[PDB]
A paper describes a structure:
F-type ATP synthases are energy-converting membrane protein complexes that synthesize adenosine triphosphate (ATP) from ADP and inorganic phosphate. These universal enzymes function by using the energy stored in an electrochemical potential across the bioenergetic membrane by rotary catalysis. Here, we investigate the mechanism for the generation of the unique cristae in the Apicomplexa, using a combination of single-particle cryo-EM, cryo-ET and subtomogram averaging.
The enlarged T. gondii Fo subcomplex differs markedly in its overall architecture from other ATP synthase structures. It displays distinct structural features including a peripheral matrix-exposed part that we term ‘wing’ region and a 360-kDa lumenal region. The Fo periphery contains several compact folds, including three coiled-coil-helix-coiled-coil-helix domain (CHCHD) containing proteins ATPTG7-9; a thioredoxin-like fold in ATPTG4; and ubiquitin-like fold in subunit-k. The dimerization interface in the membrane and lumenal regions is governed by homotypic interactions between symmetry-related subunits, most of which extend deep into both monomers. This cardiolipin pair is sequestered in the Fo subcomplex with no apparent path to the bulk membrane, suggesting a structural role. An additional 15 cardiolipins and 12 other phospholipids were found to mediate a network of interactions throughout the membrane region. We traced two cavities in the Fo subcomplex corresponding to the proton half-channels on the lumenal and matrix sides. Taken together, both half-channels are partially lined by apicomplexan-specific subunits resulting in a divergent structure and likely the involvement of different residues in proton translocation compared to structures from other organisms.
Numbering used by the authors:
A (entry chain L), J (entry chain l): 2 to 208
B (entry chain g): 115 to 226
C (entry chain d): 156 to 213, 229 to 310
D (entry chain h): 14 to 239
E (entry chain q): 2 to 134
F (entry chain e): 164 to 303
G (entry chain w): 2 to 22, 31 to 53
H (entry chain p): 15 to 122
The structure:
């Protein structure tokens, strides 16, 4: 909560309180210390406000994604169906492929499900969209075949798909690491500034 | 009964306020003063005369042009001291234990 | 009247504030652009005297401290912002009188020149046409 | 070691400092209860007022970001306003704690530029309303100074009254609204200045003869005026 | 929530309004013609429950299941019990209060006195005295 | 979007309201005796008004009349370039800065003697308490 | 002559703060002239 | 462990409450305040007669402080107001005679 | 007037008290006592003035403002004073 | 003048350019240097903008005062009449007094001129107004007298007037001195920051 | 139609922008007040964990 | 703002930062001959090539 505004004089003081003698060395040094303190406080405020705003925004984003039941490359969603989770883990980590146990109609259905899921997940700006769609199109072309005969034909596209996939994974990991490092550096700097301000307040003079 | 006072009647409301169980001295409201320029002006005058800051601070005195003192503190001195003793002994006059002194003072001050 | 308009007397407080804000914003933008330019030049030259010299690249007078407008002047027959002392009745003016079997001016009030009001009451305002010898309607 | 033992008699003895505290802490020592001061009257922002303004009843725009929720004056007050003191009256036209449109400048040059262009004054933005006692102290000091300046002046009390009306209308935080109220005493002071000057320097004029119909009716009395 | 002073506001206010109350005393009961009897001089022989309950509640607060309001209440009761004897000592020792203790007066003398003529507030000096003129 | 506006309100004449105009009103016309009076005054050498003289004796400072094409239409204009004076020292005020927050005499005076006195009273009470604590600590 | 920032009716016109402009028109004018009818217009 | 400060702040709150209750027409509340206004302080009780007889610089300091806190002149006929004023002045006098006041902004 | 100066003053007080003794300290160590108290008072004023001014404003306005609701207006000041004391005297 | 906005990509880059490997020690140190540089630039901008705004405002005030022909305690106006200058210098530095050579009417006129000038110069908020007006009122009272007899009576007020006068003069001097000192300190600090930024730019790394 | 009004469909771009600005300003004021309070507490306690 | 069903039509858009409120005016009455009918010369009738002048310089 806030404080009430400070009190003001009722009678008008224009310049009667102005000093009639130039300042002294100690007063000059105290003014310099005050300026240093205000700069330190400005830096601390910047750090604190940035940290607070980012934390709030990101927690809100997390709550929104959890509310709309989203799942990303890091599969950290418990409300998923086992089938959806298997399909997403195949798209992210494994190899999408239709089994020989299924009938041709069920294979077509499975490929359509893969395509729908992946197209809703990846937009046109996403790099992996074209390789994924190409691999699924190769699957559609090679439905009426066995996995052994389908591998030789779809490997050339699955390679690019897996490459883009691993690239995204590495991007995510590097982002986490770099953000941690930057955050820790900023927090350490803020702590050091706080201690410097503490010593300057112990040294400050006036009333 | 107590009707709203528009903003145009506030200057008269300040120097002729409505009646209350604890009213001020309306005849003395124009005499309430507290100068915020006392010490600044004193310092300015002394430094213009030629004194130093230390001499000015030693010669400084508090303002005498403040709200006048209540004459009751000098006229009803003994009765007030007795009432304060009664209060200190009887827990602030709970359940009418200093009515005696309070009524004596009220009569002395009002006279019907 | 045109002189008053130059000083912003006919303008409202909102318009005065907007003009003040516009001046503020223009000045701020000029200052920041000049700072960017000065910093770039002083960085490519590695000299502080260039920053110092950029302090006099743009001072006629100053912006007005306060402004006064026409809408700030009070008006009103009942408004106490215009009443200092009561004006004597032998100096107050009279309202016109009209009374006859055919017409009068007492069944209504048209108001002042500024604060006007409908002379007919609410029930007969939708039938104002019926209380006229001639009626020239609006253009719409 | 507990903090503030002998400092909360209001809490020990159920003494409410105001009807709001009474209603909150359920002391129930106010016979007439409490009519809460709504939030739109407890806080808010400065607004445009004139009907001859297009942005009327809209918050005032500043160079800085400001909450645009406005302070609403009490337009339909209840018949009984038991407390008719200045304390309770001022809340109908201003918020005691001041308006909520104060800036926190990120730098000193922004403050400088705002002031230079006439868009900021701490006297106006970082402040509360003045209490009746403060108003009276200021008025009495000003009156003493004016009397010391010149006792044999006729416009003295007029100047004092315009000062008083400004202080009462809180010109520090509502200068335009207060000038709207005090320009009348300013005008009276102007007139009195001219009158004093013409009495000091003998200035008179040749009056014309009396008009043939000075009296509307013969039986009417012609009251003589200086 | 407000408890109106005039439930029948249009009618009651006119012929039976409410006056400004009088708080100095009840004014509905007789006026005592004698002062209060001097209460017995106290001592520390009456702080038993106060002290023991303050100790108990302070211990329970150091634990953390007591609270602060109870601590304040108990401490203030004990402090009042001590201030009793402190004030008794002051009154019985200091000489300026002996007259106040044996002070007596009657409503008749109160009404006959004439000091009310001098209850007029003074006048603040001139502001020129600041400059010494 | 203000010029050439439409008729926004209706024009009408209420029944039996008078007009006060006869049928020859259009042939009627106004007249003022002022032109003839001026001619007659000029011809008979009657007293002239002082407005015919450009110099103005109605004040102590020099004023000269500016005429708008006729001696009857004039405005006095001052000649002096008035010198103004300020019994004020420079550099003694920084209004943009909030002074109630800074520590010092100027700060306390931008605040008031009441706040300073309250602070001093708190100071005295705190000193009393701390002196009691010092006594009870050093007596051990 | 006491509360200048609060009494704008007694303040100079904005053309006076500008430092730029036989006989010339006055450089300094107040807003209090608005309270007079024949201040600027002539008495013809 | 801070009785002087605590009782000062409490007395100020009670004065404010008395004023508010007077404004709102509440005899019960204002009498509650008057009763709770710390009448059992031996130090202030002992300083009361000293203030009633003081004179000069000490009295001027105390009156300056009391005008800073409560500048409104109480009615010369209300004994409750008179007594609360006397009590506050006696408290300030005790504080001053223990540790004098320094009211000037200029000081070192 | 600074924390360092006040701490040095209190150290001077304590050492002079140890030198004098528990019987003549109050008589022999008055000037140092006053200097230490004045320094601690300047520190307290500088570090708790905002809260004092806030309490003064609340008292002026009868505790009708938002920040005057509850007991924070008083607890903040008392806590500031306690912190200053605990930082100076021990 | 300003530069044109920088160019932007036409095709949408969402995250394809994000790093796939965590940063290194040198890159971290370079980021820290960049932050230090931006803080230095912020401080420099604050100093420069404050200096510029104040200089412009004060030059404008000076031009306005010169345009309206103002004169202050420092009599630095050349368009003054000799009589006005003598009167102002008597009010500021000397002693206002009526001469015995003048007739009583001329003495009254001189005192009225003094009063008008001083009341237009000093407002009610000014401290010296009351002493000045009191001294001039004493002069009015003692017109029909000689200077020798008038001194004994008006000295008690002239003392206070001269005190307030010298106080204002000392205020002005101290203000000038303190402003000079503060300005010089700020400028030195800005220069030091500029040199620090120069060395940090020589040490910076990247492209 | 009432559902649309909840989402601001009948509102104009000016009104949408003003609501957005209002949210921005409320959030900013809350943040700055909280910062002032946190700094005061952390200064009287001389500890960074309070800010945290 | 553009729509006639907006109260602040033909008025500058408000931002959290201070902005010059002088607006870009589209070409409503163009000349008959517009010799250059390329996109370069056409875009200037509805947008400014250099962008709008309402960009912020954030202090933090
Ligand atoms: C603070 C306290 C204050 C308190 C209050 C104090 C008040 C103030 C102080 C008071 C002090 C007291 C003072 C006294 C009171 C003041 C009164 C006053 O001054 O009046 C003001 C007030 C008016 O003041 P105002 O401000 O001007 O009001 C607005 C105007 O009036 C608006 O005008 P309008 O637009 O409504 O138009 C009206 C129109 C109205 O015009 C008409 O009504 C005329 C219609 C005629 C139709 C038929 C005509 C046929 C003739 C044909 C001729 C041959 C052909 C020629 C063709 C061309 C001619 C048609 O014009 C006229 O009025 C014309 C009037 C002039 C002619 C008068 C003719 C008199 C003839 C009398 C005949 C007597 C016969 C006796 C036989 C007995 C039986 C055996 O008085 C009125 O009320 C006005 C109306 C008066 C009524 C007149 C009606 C006459 C009708 C005669 C018909 C005859 C037919 C007979 C048939 C029966 C036999 C078969
Ligand atoms: C029931 C109640 C009984 C008890 C009574 C109680 C009341 C007692 C008290 C008396 C009433 C007092 C009440 C207060 C009055 C205040 C209100 C007021 O008076 O003014 C309101 C009222 C308000 O008007 P306003 O809008 O305010 O304007 C005011 C203006 O100041 C004036 O406006 P304006 O100037 O525009 O109006 C004048 C109008 C009328 O003015 C006149 O005409 C002047 C009067 C002359 C009369 C004599 C000529 C008659 C000719 C007859 C011959 C026709 C052919 C014969 C056919 C026979 C077969 C039918 O002018 C014209 O309209 C155009 C005519 C221009 C020519 C006139 C000069 C030439 C005359 C010769 C004709 C030559 C034609 C040649 C053509 C060119 C060829 C090259 O004023 C008038 O309306 C004025 C005219 C009123 C005429 C009423 C029509 C009825 C007249 C008969 C009345 C009853 C007769 C009784 C029997 C006696 C006759 C047999
Ligand atoms: C000298 C007296 C004898 C001669 C009588 C002259 C004619 C009398 C006039 C008509 C009387 C009725 O008038 C009727 O009531 C009042 C008149 O003010 C008007 O009513 C209007 O003004 C009143 C003000 O009092 C408002 O309260 C009301 O809300 C409004 O509608 C009606 O518009 C009118 O239709
Ligand atoms: C025996 C004495 C003469 C007896 C006859 C008296 C008859 C007087 C009545 C005539 C009408 C007077 O009506 C009015 O009064 C006086 C003159 O009297 C004049 O009044 C005016 O001139 C006279 C000069 O005598 C001035 O004193 C007066 O200040 C001025 O107002 C008016 O110009 C005139 O219009
Ligand atoms: C072709 C032939 C032309 C014939 C010309 C005839 C000329 C006649 C001119 C007479 C003019 C008189 O004019 C009128 O007279 C009277 C007294 O006499 C003046 O005086 C009257 O009014 C004024 C004030 O109103 C006062 O003097 C006084 O109250 C009254 O006596 C009038 O102010 C004046 O308007």
């Amino acid at each position: 909560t806030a404080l009430p505004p400070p009190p003001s004089a009722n009678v008008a003081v224009s310049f009667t309180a102005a000093p009639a003698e130039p300042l002294s060395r100690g007063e000059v040094k105290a003014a310099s210390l005050k300026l240093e303190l205000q700069n330190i406080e400005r830096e601390l405020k910047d750090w604190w406000m940035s940290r607070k705003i980012l934390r709030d925004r990101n927690i809100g984003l997390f709550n929104l994604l959890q509310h709309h039941n989203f799942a990303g490359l890091s599969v950290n969603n418990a409300k998923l169906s086992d089938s959806q989770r298997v399909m997403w883990t195949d798209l992210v980590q494994g190899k999408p492929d239709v089994e020989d146990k299924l009938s041709v109609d069920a294979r077509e259905m499975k490929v359509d499900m893969y395509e729908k899921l992946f197209k809703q997940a990846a937009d046109l700006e996403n790099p992996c969209r074209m390789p994924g769609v190409a691999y699924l199109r190769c699957l559609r072309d090679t439905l009426t075949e066995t996995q052994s005969a389908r591998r030789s034909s779809c490997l050339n596209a699955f390679s690019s798909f897996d490459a883009c996939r691993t690239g995204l994974l590495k991007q995510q990991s590097a982002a986490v690491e770099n953000s941690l490092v930057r955050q820790n550096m900023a927090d350490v700097r803020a702590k050091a500034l706080f201690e410097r301000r503490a010593v300057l307040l112990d040294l400050v003079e006036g009333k | 009964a107590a009707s709203t006072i528009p903003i145009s009647q506030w200057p008269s409301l300040l120097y002729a306020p409505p009646s209350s169980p604890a009213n001020p001295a309306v005849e003395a409201l124009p005499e309430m003063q507290f100068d915020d320029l006392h010490y600044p002006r004193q310092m300015l005058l002394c430094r213009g005369a030629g004194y130093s800051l230390e001499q000015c601070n030693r010669m400084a005195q508090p303002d005498a042009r403040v709200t006048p003192e209540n004459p009751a503190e000098k006229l009803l001195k003994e009765e007030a001291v007795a009432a304060i003793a009664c209060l200190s002994q009887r827990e602030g006059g709970k359940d009418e234990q200093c009515r005696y002194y309070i009524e004596r003072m009220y009569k002395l001050a009002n006279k019907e | 009247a045109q002189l008053h308009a130059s000083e912003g007397f006919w303008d409202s407080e909102s318009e005065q504030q907007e003009a003040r804000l516009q001046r503020h914003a223009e000045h701020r933008n000029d200052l920041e652009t000049t700072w960017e330019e000065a910093l770039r030049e002083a960085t490519l030259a590695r000299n502080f005297d260039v920053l110092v010299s950029y302090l006099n690249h743009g001072q006629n007078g100053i912006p007005p401290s306060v402004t006064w407008n026409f809408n700030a002047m009070p008006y009103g027959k009942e408004n106490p912002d215009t009443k200092t002392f009561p004006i004597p009745d032998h100096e107050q003016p009279y309202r016109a009188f009209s009374l006859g079997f055919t017409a009068n001016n007492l069944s209504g009030n048209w108001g002042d020149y500024i604060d006007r009001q409908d002379n007919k009451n609410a029930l007969m305002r939708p039938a104002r046409m019926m209380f006229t010898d001639v009626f020239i309607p609006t253009t719409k | 070691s507990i903090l503030g033992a002998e400092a909360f008699p209001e809490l020990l003895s159920k003494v409410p400092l105001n009807p709001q505290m009474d209603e909150d802490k359920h002391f129930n020592k106010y016979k007439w209860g409490n009519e809460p001061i709504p939030v739109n009257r407890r806080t808010g922002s400065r607004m445009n007022s004139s009907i001859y303004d297009n942005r009327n009843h809209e918050a005032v725009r500043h160079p800085w970001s400001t909450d645009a929720r406005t302070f609403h004056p009490n337009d339909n007050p209840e018949a009984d306003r038991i407390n008719t003191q200045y304390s309770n009256m001022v809340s109908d036209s201003f918020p005691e704690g001041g308006f909520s449109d104060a800036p926190r400048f990120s730098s000193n040059w922004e403050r400088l530029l705002a002031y230079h262009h006439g868009l900021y004054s701490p006297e106006k933005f970082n402040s509360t309303t003045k209490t009746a006692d403060e108003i009276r102290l200021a008025v009495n000091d000003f009156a003493a100074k004016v009397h010391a300046d010149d006792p044999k002046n006729a416009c003295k009390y007029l100047m004092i009254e315009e000062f008083k009306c400004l202080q009462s209308a809180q010109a520090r935080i509502d200068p335009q609204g207060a000038a709207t109220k005090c320009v009348k005493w300013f005008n009276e002071w102007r007139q009195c200045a001219w009158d004093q000057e013409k009495m000091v320097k003998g200035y008179n004029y040749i009056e014309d003869r009396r008009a043939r119909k000075h009296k509307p009716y013969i039986g009417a009395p012609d009251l003589q005026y200086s | 929530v407000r408890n109106q002073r005039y439930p029948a506001s249009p009618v009651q206010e006119i012929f039976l309004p409410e006056p400004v109350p009088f708080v100095q005393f009840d004014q509905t009961a007789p006026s005592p013609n004698s002062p209060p009897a001097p209460l017995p001089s106290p001592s520390l022989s009456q702080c038993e429950e106060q002290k023991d309950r303050y100790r108990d509640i302070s211990s329970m607060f150091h634990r953390g299941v007591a609270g602060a309001e109870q601590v304040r209440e108990a401490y203030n009761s004990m402090a009042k019990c001590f201030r009793r004897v402190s004030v008794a000592e002051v009154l019985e020792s200091d000489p300026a209060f002996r007259q106040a203790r044996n002070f007596t007066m009657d409503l008749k003398q109160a009404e006959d006195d004439q000091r009310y003529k001098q209850l007029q507030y003074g006048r603040v000096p001139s502001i020129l005295t600041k400059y010494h003129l | 979007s203000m010029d050439h506006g439409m008729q926004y309100s209706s024009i009408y004449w209420e029944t039996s309201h008078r007009t006060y105009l006869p049928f020859w009103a259009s042939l009627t016309q106004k007249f003022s005796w002022k032109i003839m009076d001026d001619q007659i005054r000029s011809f008979l050498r009657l007293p002239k008004p002082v407005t015919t003289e450009p110099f103005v004796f109605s004040s102590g400072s020099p004023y000269i009349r500016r005429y708008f094409g006729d001696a009857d239409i004039s405005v006095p204009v001052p000649l002096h370039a008035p010198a103004h004076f300020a019994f004020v020292p420079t550099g003694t005020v920084s209004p943009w800065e909030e002074t109630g927050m800074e520590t010092g005499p100027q700060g306390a005076a931008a605040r008031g003697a009441a706040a300073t006195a309250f602070r001093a009273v708190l100071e005295s009470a705190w000193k009393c308490d701390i002196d009691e604590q010092i006594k009870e600590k050093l007596h051990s | 002559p006491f509360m200048w920032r609060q009494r704008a009716y007694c303040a100079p016109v904005p053309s006076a703060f500008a430092s730029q402009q036989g006989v010339r028109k006055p450089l300094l004018r107040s807003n209090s002239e608005s309270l007079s009818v024949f201040s600027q217009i002539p008495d013809g | 462990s801070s009785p002087h400060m605590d009782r000062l702040l409490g007395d100020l709150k009670l004065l404010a409450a008395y004023d508010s209750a007077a404004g709102w027409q509440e005899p019960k509340a204002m009498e509650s305040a008057f009763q709770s206004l710390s009448w059992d302080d031996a130090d202030v009780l002992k300083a009361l007669p000293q203030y009633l007889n003081c004179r000069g610089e000490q009295k001027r300091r105390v009156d300056f402080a009391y005008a800073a806190l409560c500048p409104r002149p109480v009615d010369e006929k209300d004994p409750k107001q008179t007594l609360m004023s006397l009590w506050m002045k006696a408290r300030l006098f005790s504080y001053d005679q223990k540790h004098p006041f320094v009211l000037s902004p200029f000081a070192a | 007037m600074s924390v360092f100066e006040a701490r040095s003053s209190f150290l001077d007080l304590e050492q002079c008290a140890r030198a004098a003794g528990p019987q003549r300290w109050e008589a022999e160590c008055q000037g140092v006592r006053q200097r230490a108290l004045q320094a601690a008072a300047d520190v307290m004023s500088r570090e708790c003035g905002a809260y004092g001014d806030s309490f003064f404003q609340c008292y002026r306005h009868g505790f009708r403002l938002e920040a005057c609701q509850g007991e924070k207006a008083t607890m903040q000041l008392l806590r500031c004073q306690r912190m200053v004391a605990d930082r100076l005297v021990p």
